[PDB]
């Protein structure tokens, strides 16, 4: 598809294999790897017991214990994908430690090489991204029954009840809805080319439809975080050492580069299918010099390369608003505003979210609402009519 | 061969094909101002007659080229307002007459309100006589700063040295059909003209020297071409009056906007914009200063499959040595490069400039480590 877009032109009349993008899952990768080569063990010993290993004081003890493994025996993206995600979870709590203040600002060779060196081969940075802790840590718990949160478990948490389990798969669950309406992307780009009008305004209404599905299931949120375990535990897990006073200069990835390195904490602004549809859309998230902007641009090298790439692409494709904007059709102009609508209750109800779990405990985080403010104020003036 | 649609000239590549000299009749107070900006500036007459002009409606620029020169003639005009005489009193606020025309015509060509690389070299040149070839003595550029300001000698150089790199570019289709037809001997062989042409493009590079003088670039021209984010002159941007509330920030032109020397490092798969340093995140935000076709062909090129990745998985001599080839062809670009820097910038500085050599020895450096052997 890449070669002949380079003669062709950017026109995206199919969803290429190459984006790695599942027709289930989306964005998330499909049936993740839960176990790796038995010659791994002592990783998995460890990232399977970081919450009694970290509570115990005897994490950081395991991880300078460990011998150095070579990467070489991770043969498949799968494998080299679960590998990540057991890498970085050991990275986040040796870091962090207890996560009360004593942090260890160098990451010894033994984990920090086999790390570096999977990255470099994944293509994305040494720390965990949301590719790693919400799109491929998880399983199903009957494979021969659907995917829903009562099926499904993660395969990596940080400490005991810190309701890591309740915020990646709901995360998952509500990205694998959204993704339901990739299919459609196709159908958007060649009705605009074969100027198909009917064919292009059902197609804005079953992409509305999908992401008025997913806010759906965001409630189940609820159900299973709570503000307390949420805001005073993983969170701290979570955090990365980019403009972080605790790790002001960086990680010293010990072996693999000379300097501390600095990279950003897990964001759900790395979350391919959101910007995919701002991108879509016509929502220009990524345009002027503004921080908000600026973060999502850069959250894209935190993406899988094929999903970066997919983003970009969508990007060089004609836009769908300029065509509906151009058109004096009001019913086309209604399910464009269909889908933007959609986007606007999602990240409204977003910010509640945030208020409860993150605004409220944090007086018992501006800056959090400000940028959260910024993305969905951009959605509501893309709308057409108020 | 590569699609029209990324808008790359057969000839001058990436470079606006056989620009626009003049504007229509409508825009007669823009092209006198930008025509004069030597002579406006020096006088001290060139604020006033910025603040004098009628806000003129961008509709009357019917075509690309005719829009590419007026964001070549707007934004001459900004930077001379901006800056002045250039001995450090500095406007902070454009104009609404011409921050509006200039905002607008900037959203619509997709590109920031500030000069860039696009505008000031690959837009804003001329051939002396349309009978002779592309050479140094058979070119012109349209807009100057100030007399003596050697802008002739430094955006003709980079346009010789852009347009002799686009060369290299014809092959990229033959590089990645020979790796999915799994052609070894054709893949070898357009490797080997990816290298020739980067050769070609280092001797092209020498005539710096005869066109630009230290003194003259590093005091003159290089204040007239500073932008305004993370500039202590202007610490919070610039206001672009009556289209934005509150200031702007922009970074001012660069060659890492330059839409071929990415091309490559894309293509020989140098992963310039890799690992979250501040030359990478300089590159990357580069892009986003491009015309949209050019950042669109750069998106594609990633897209592609690895070159590097192909002849590092082939056991194969020959080719990984056709692709070291490539490689150090762009390590003696930029090695040359960084010694006409010490010249033109570091040592006028000293009579400091040590933050750019670090971002071109890091980008420089990137390049060394990826020879295979
Ligand atoms: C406990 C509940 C949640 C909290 C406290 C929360 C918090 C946040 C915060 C603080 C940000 C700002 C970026 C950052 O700091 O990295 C963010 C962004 C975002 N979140 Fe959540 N989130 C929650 C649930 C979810 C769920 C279930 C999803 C669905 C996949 C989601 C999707 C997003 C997206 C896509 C963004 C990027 C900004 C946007 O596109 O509007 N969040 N979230
Ligand atoms: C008077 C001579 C020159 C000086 C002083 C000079 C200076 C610089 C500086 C300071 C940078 C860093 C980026 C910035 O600050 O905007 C840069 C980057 C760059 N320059 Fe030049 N330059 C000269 C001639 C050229 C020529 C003739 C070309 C050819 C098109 C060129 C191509 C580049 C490229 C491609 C970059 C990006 C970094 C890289 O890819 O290695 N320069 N230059
Ligand atoms: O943006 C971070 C986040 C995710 C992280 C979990 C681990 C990797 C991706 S999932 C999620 C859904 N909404 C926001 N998302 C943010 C980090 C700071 C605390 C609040 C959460
Ligand atoms: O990076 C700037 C620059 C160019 C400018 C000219 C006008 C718009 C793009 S051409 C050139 C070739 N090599 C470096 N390039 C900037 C120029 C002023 C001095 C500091 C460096």
Redesign the interface.
Known sequence: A??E??????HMWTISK?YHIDEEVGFALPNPQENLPDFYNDWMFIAKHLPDLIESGQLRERVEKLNMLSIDHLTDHKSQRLARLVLGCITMAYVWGKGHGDVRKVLPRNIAVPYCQLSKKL?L?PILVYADCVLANWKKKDPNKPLTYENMDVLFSFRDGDCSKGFFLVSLLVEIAAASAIKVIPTVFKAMQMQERDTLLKALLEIASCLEKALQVFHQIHDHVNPKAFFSVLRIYLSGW?GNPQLSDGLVYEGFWEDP???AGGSAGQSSVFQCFDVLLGIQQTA??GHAAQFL??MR?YMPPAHR?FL??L??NPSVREFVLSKGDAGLREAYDACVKALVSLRSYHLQIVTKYILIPASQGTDLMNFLKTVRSTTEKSLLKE
């Not at 877009?5 to 950017?10: A, D, E, I, N, S």
């Open positions: 890449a070669l877009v380079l003669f062709q032109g950017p190459e293509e940075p980019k390195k600095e990279f002027g010099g641009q850069d090298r790439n970009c692409s990007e060089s």
